[PDB]
Amino acid sequence: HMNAQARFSQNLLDQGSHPTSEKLLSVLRPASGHVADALGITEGENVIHLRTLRRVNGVALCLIDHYFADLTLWPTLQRFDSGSLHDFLREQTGIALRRSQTRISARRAQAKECQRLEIPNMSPLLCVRTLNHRDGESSPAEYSVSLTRADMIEFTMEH
């Protein structure tokens, strides 16, 4: 057994659709070049953007930006409030998202990140970026960018 070196342990596969998560924003907005590339779409074309935040005992720990290319999902995703985003989508539409690719990196918090995660400038973040496809195939339905306070959470994975 490996002991935990951070206060909280989070399963990597569960982290993007956590059940204590709260929606902070749900808007239609033009796709940045980086969002457009992940989704396989055109820069500046509208995407659904939801931002969610989870706290533990008040303390913001994980902020996630979720981008979907399928605007048919808008009347559904705008009604998400709190809880597991993917569970919400699945009950509403029967669409079950599964992960295709994950990227994990660490960087110093800059700018709007410090503000939204409520942390001092340059505090380390773990950044987990995932492409999810419908239980089906290989056109990503969701690109999510999660930023977690590295001083509070360690990710775990069982194989």
Contact 37, 137 (CB under 8 A): no
**Binding residues among 101-120 for ligand BDF as defined by CB under 6 A:** 118-119
**Parallel, antiparallel, or unpaired for β 140-149 and 59-68?**
antiparallel
Name which position in 50, 95, 125, 147 contacts its own copies (CB under 8 A).
125
Nearest to 142 by CA among 66, 50, 76: 66
With CB cut-offs between 5 and 8 Å by kind, which of ligand BDF, its own copies, none does residue 29 bind? none
- Close Cβ partners of 78 (under 8 Å, ≥ 6 residues apart): 26, 48
Q: How many residues bind its own copies (CB under 8 A)?
A: 38
Give min distance, CB of 35 to its own copies, in A: 10
Q: How far apart are CA 127 and CA 119, in angstroms?
A: 15
In terms of CB distance, is 35 or 61 closer to ligand BDF?
61
Q: Which residues bind its own copies (CB under 8 A)?
A: 1-6, 9, 12, 34, 37-38, 40, 98-108, 124-127, 129, 131, 143, 150-151, 154-159
